[PDB]
């Protein structure tokens, strides 16, 4: 049966360049035209080309002919994508997918688990974490988890010992290149005098763990 | 190129309900357009092809109608594994060119947010920022309207917010708003204040603090 699996993504500053790869297996590879299409996180699909593994016939859409290359090793039943010179707008979810290409032209009828490709020219660093403080019958209160870099963190409550009524936002890419993100929690008013509330981050990129007393 | 033009951005219905999707292309496309459905962190599933076609396994509810330049998914009786986001896409021509999408999320009664303001911490000010947190809780529908005021002054430019997915006990969001100040300013000003705006709420909802208190 048709399985597609991509690799290759990560990590990459301005200008760099990096090549994606797409393992095809289940099927017969030289039968199908293969395709790369890209989704900026929050946005819509982009299709950037297609290969035949047969010959390597290729069609590009215009928008990446300067800067992508597609091309197959068909005795690997494997296709690539070497991105070059990239930039921010190329921060997306790259899947290759299998071609259609039958009425009229091309749609996808089996697609890959997709990599991610950030762009970005921060520098891998673990947050600093502090209070939100519950205001002096329910309280929040909450923990801010600043300045880090690359995505991503978790946070937990008590342990775990917490969950319900437990917030974690997505975080938001600040315009210094680091993410910020918050955690909240909503608790009886009369608990605020007795009941102790710690948040547990852990940040795996830069081995950093942070319990902070709330 | 073809552009593909996706009605409505968003739509919050009930398990049950008649959905239609619409997408339009900029010129005509003949009979095909393919559509998919995608769920949170997954790729897009193949549901229909040349406009009306269902790819072999997709349920009897999922169909799809048009020519031309406008054409419409329908989801006759929504199911709870429904809840996605759909795209069109044309394949009469290359390039390939998508719809912008529909998110289809759980319709449920409206919700006024509950609003905590949070003042920053000791520990930040010694770095020489400080970050003012603004959380708007457990409300619906998603849409809403944070404005951060300084001493009365409306601040413009130096806040991020992010917005959680629908909870998936009481289907609400929540919302945080973050208002960046380097130490300096932040301690030339006293009044720090959150100022709400939500369909919920009969007029805007502020929490605020005094620096200090």
């Known amino acids: 049966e048709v399985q597609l699996v991509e690799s290759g993504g990560g990590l990459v500053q301005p200008g760099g360049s990096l090549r994606l790869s797409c393992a095809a297996s289940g099927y017969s590879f030289t039968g199908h035209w293969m395709n790369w299409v890209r989704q900026a996180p929050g946005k819509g699909l982009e299709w950037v080309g297609m290969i035949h593994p047969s010959d390597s016939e290729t069609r590009y859409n215009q928008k990446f002919k300067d800067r992508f290359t597609i091309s197959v090793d068909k005795s690997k039943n494997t296709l690539y994508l070497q991105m070059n010179s990239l930039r921010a707008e190329d921060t997306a979810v790259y899947y290759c997918?299998?071609?259609?290409?039958?009425?009229?032209?091309?749609?996808?009828?089996?697609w890959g688990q997709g990599t991610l490709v950030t762009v970005s020219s921060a520098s891998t660093k673990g947050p600093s974490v502090f209070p939100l403080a519950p205001s002096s019958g329910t309280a929040a209160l909450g923990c801010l988890v600043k300045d880090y870099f690359p995505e991503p963190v978790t946070v937990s409550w008590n342990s775990g010992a917490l969950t319900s009524g437990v917030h974690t936002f997505p975080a938001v890419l600040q315009s210094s290149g680091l993410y910020s993100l918050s955690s909240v929690v909503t608790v009886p008013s009369s608990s605020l005098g007795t009941q102790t509330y710690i948040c547990n981050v852990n940040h795996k990129p830069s081995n950093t763990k942070v319990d902070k007393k709330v | 190129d073809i552009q593909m033009t996706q009605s409505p951005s968003s739509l919050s219905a009930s398990v049950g309900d008649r959905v239609t999707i619409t997408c339009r292309a900029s010129?005509?496309?003949?009979?095909?357009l393919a559509w998919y459905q995608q769920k949170p962190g997954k790729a897009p599933k193949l549901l229909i092809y040349?406009?009306?076609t269902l790819q072999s396994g997709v349920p009897s509810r999922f169909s799809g109608s048009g020519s031309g330049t406008d054409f419409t998914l329908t989801i006759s009786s929504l199911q709870p594994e429904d809840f996605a986001t759909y795209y069109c896409?044309?394949?009469?021509?290359?390039?390939?060119?998508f719809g912008q999408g529909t998110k289809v999320e759980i319709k449920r009664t409206v919700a006024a947010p509950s609003v905590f303001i949070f003042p920053p911490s000791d520990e930040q000010l010694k770095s020489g920022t400080a970050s003012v947190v603004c959380l708007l809780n457990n409300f619906y529908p998603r849409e809403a309207k944070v404005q951060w005021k300084v001493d009365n002054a409306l601040q413009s430019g130096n806040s991020q917010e992010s917005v959680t997915e629908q909870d998936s006990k009481d289907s609400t969001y929540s919302l945080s708003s973050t208002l960046t100040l380097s130490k300096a300013d932040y301690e030339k000003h006293k009044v720090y204040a959150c100022e709400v705006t939500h369909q919920g709420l009969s007029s805007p909802v502020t929490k605020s603090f005094n620096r200090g208190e």
């Open positions: 010129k005509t496309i003949s009979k095909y």
């Open positions: 997918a299998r071609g259609i290409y039958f009425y009229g032209t091309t749609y996808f009828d089996y």
């Open positions: 040349s406009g009306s």
């Open positions: 896409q044309q394949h009469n021509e290359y390039p390939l060119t």
